[PDB]
Amino acid sequence: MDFRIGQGYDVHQLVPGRPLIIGGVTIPYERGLLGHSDADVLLHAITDALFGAAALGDIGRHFSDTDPRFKGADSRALLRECASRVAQAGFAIRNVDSTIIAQAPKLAPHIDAMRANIAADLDLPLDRVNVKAKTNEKLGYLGRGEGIEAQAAALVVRE
Amino acid sequence: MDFRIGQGYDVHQLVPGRPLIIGGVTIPYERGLLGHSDADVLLHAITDALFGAAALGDIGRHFSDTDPRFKGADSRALLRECASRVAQAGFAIRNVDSTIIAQAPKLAPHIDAMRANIAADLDLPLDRVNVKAKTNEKLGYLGRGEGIEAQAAALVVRE
Amino acid sequence: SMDFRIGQGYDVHQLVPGRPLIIGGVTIPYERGLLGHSDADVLLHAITDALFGAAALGDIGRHFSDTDPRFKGADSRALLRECASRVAQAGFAIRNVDSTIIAQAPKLAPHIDAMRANIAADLDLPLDRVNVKAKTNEKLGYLGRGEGIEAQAAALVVRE
Numbered sequence: 001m002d003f004r005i006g007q008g009y010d011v012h013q014l015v016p017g018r019p020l021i022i023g024g025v026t027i028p029y030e031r032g033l034l035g036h037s038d039a040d041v042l043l044h045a046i047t048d049a050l051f052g053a054a055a056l057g058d059i060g061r062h063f064s065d066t067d068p069r070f071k072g073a074d075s076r077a078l079l080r081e082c083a084s085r086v087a088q089a090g091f092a093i094r095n096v097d098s099t100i101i102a103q104a105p106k107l108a109p110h111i112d113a114m115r116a117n118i119a120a121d122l123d124l125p126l127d128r129v130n131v132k133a134k135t136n137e138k139l140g141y142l143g144r145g146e147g148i149e150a151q152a153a154a155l156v157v158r159e
Numbered sequence: 160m161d162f163r164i165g166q167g168y169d170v171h172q173l174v175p176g177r178p179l180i181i182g183g184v185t186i187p188y189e190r191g192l193l194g195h196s197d198a199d200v201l202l203h204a205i206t207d208a209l210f211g212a213a214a215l216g217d218i219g220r221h222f223s224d225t226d227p228r229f230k231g232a233d234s235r236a237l238l239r240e241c242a243s244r245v246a247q248a249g250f251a252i253r254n255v256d257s258t259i260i261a262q263a264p265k266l267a268p269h270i271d272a273m274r275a276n277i278a279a280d281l282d283l284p285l286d287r288v289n290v291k292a293k294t295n296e297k298l299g300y301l302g303r304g305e306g307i308e309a310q311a312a313a314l315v316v317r318e
Numbered sequence: 319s320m321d322f323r324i325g326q327g328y329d330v331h332q333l334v335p336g337r338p339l340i341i342g343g344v345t346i347p348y349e350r351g352l353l354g355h356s357d358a359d360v361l362l363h364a365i366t367d368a369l370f371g372a373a374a375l376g377d378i379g380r381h382f383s384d385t386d387p388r389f390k391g392a393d394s395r396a397l398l399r400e401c402a403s404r405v406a407q408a409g410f411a412i413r414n415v416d417s418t419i420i421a422q423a424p425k426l427a428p429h430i431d432a433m434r435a436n437i438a439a440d441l442d443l444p445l446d447r448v449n450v451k452a453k454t455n456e457k458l459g460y461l462g463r464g465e466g467i468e469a470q471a472a473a474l475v476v477r478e
C-alpha cells in the first residue's frame with residue numbers, strides 16, 4: 001500500500017527540417033521537433049513522471065547529454081532504462097496517463113501505436129497506459145504550431 | 160487496491176457573444192468560452208482526467224468536436240456520460256482536484272457552486288472534489304485574458 | 319488506510335529586478351527574482367496548492383489573506399508548514415510530493431537537493447518521499463524569454 005505519484009512535463013520547438021517523433025511513432029509532417037536525439041516530448045514527460053514517483057530526480061540527472069553511455073540512445077531506450085531503475089529502487093508501475101498538446105497534425109490515428117510502444121517499454125498491460133491528444137485552440141506558441149508539449153502522470157507502488 | 164491516476168488539461172478562447180460556463184456555472188460576463196460544445200473548460204479537463212485514469216482515451220475520442228450531436232452540448236451531461244463509462248469499465252472514482260487559470264472575471268464567488276456541480280455529476284460527496292482558481296500573474300495569453308485554462312487530476316480504483 | 323487522494327498544483331511568478339531569487343527555500347544567485355508576497359517562492363506555492371487540493375481544502379487564495387495578522391509577514395516556508403498543518407487537521411497524512419520547475423535560467427541542478435531537503439523538513443517527510451525536477455522551456459514563450467518561472471506539483475495523501 002506504499003503508493004507514490006509522479007508528474008512530468010516536456011516541450012520542444014517545432015520547425016521544418018527534422019522528423020516528427022512522438023511516443024516512438026514517426027509522423028509525416030512539414031515540421032519536426034528540435035532537440036537532442038529524437039526529441040520525443042511524450043516519452044520524456046513519461047520518463048520524468050516515473051523518476052518523480054520514485055523520488056529519483058529527473059531525466060537530466062540520469063541521462064546527461066554529455067554521458068557517453070547514452071550518446072546514441074533514443075528516447076525509448078531512455079524510457080526502458082528509467083523503468084529498470086524504478087524497478088531496482090523497489091517500485092512497480094501501476095499506470096501512466098498523458099496528454100500531447102499540438103495544434104497540428106492530427107495525432108488520433110497514432111495513439112494506439114504510441115500506447116503499444118510505451119506499454120512494451122514499461123512491461124505494462126496495455127490497459128494501464130493512456131495517451132490523450134488535443135490542440136491549444138490556436139492560443140500561444142503551441143496554438144501557432146511553434147512547439148509541442150507533453151504532460152504525464154504516473155502511479156507506482158513500493159513492493 | 161487497483162488504483163489508477165489520470166490527468167487532464169484544457170483551454171478555450173474567450174470571445175464576445177458566448178455564455179461563460181465554467182464548472183457548470185453560468186457566470187455573468189461580457190465574454191464566454193468558444194467551442195463546439197458549451198466550451199466548459201473545467202469540466203473538459205476533469206473529463207479527460209477521468210478517461211485517462213481508466214485508460215479509455217480522451218474527450219475527443221468519446222465526444223467528437225466534429226459531430227453535430229455535440230454542438231452546444233451541456234458539458235455536465237458529457238461529464239456524467241464519461242463517469243458512466245468509467246464505471247462500466249469497472250472503476251470507482253475516489254477524488255478529483257482541479258485548477259482554473261483566468262485573468263478575469265473573479266471566480267472565487269462561483270467555486271463552491273462548481274464543486275457541488277462536479278460532485279453531483281460524479282456521485283461524490285463534496286469532500287472528494289476540489290476546485291482551485293488563480294490568475295496567471297499577468298503572463299502570456301492567459302495574462303492578456305485571451306482564453307481560460309483548466310487542469311485536473313483524478314484518482315480511481317478498479318473494483 | 320486505503321483512502322488515498324491526489325492533488326495537483328500550478329504556479330507562475332514574474333522575474334523582476336531588485337529581488338532575490340528564492341525557489342524551494344534556496345536563494346539562488348541571479349540578476350532578477352520572483353515578484354510576489356514575501357519571497358514569492360513559486361515551487362512552494364505549487365506544492366501548497368497540490369496539498370490543499372489533495373485534502374479537498376480549496377486553495378491558497380482561500381486560506382491565506384493579505385489581511386490576516388498571522389500571515390502578513392510569513393514567508394513561503396511558513397505558509398507551506400501551515401498548509402501541512404491544515405492537511406493534518408483535516409485528517410490526512412502526506413505520502414509523497416513530486417514537482418517540476420520550469421526556468422530558462424539560471425541553472426537549477428546544483429540547488430535541487432537543498433530544495434528537496436527544505437520541503438521534506440517543512441512537510442515532516444523523509445527525503446525519499448519528496449522530489450523536485452528542473453527543466454527549461456526550450457526558449458518558447460514567456461518562460462523561454464525569461465519573463466517568469468513556473469512550478470508544477472503533484473501530491474498523494476491518505477485519510478488516516
Ligand SMILES: CS(=O)(=O)Nc1cccc2cccnc12
Pocket residue numbers: 293296329331353354355357358359363364367378379
Ligand atoms: C505572486 S505571489 O508570489 O504573491 N503568489 C500568489 C499571490 C496571490 C495568489 C496566489 C495563489 C496561488 C499561488 N500564488 C499566489
Ligand SMILES: [Zn+2]
Pocket residue numbers: 010011012035039040041044
Ligand atoms: Zn525533451
Ligand SMILES: [Zn+2]
Pocket residue numbers: 169170171194198199200203
Ligand atoms: Zn474543451
Ligand SMILES: [Zn+2]
Pocket residue numbers: 329330331354358359360363
Ligand atoms: Zn504564487
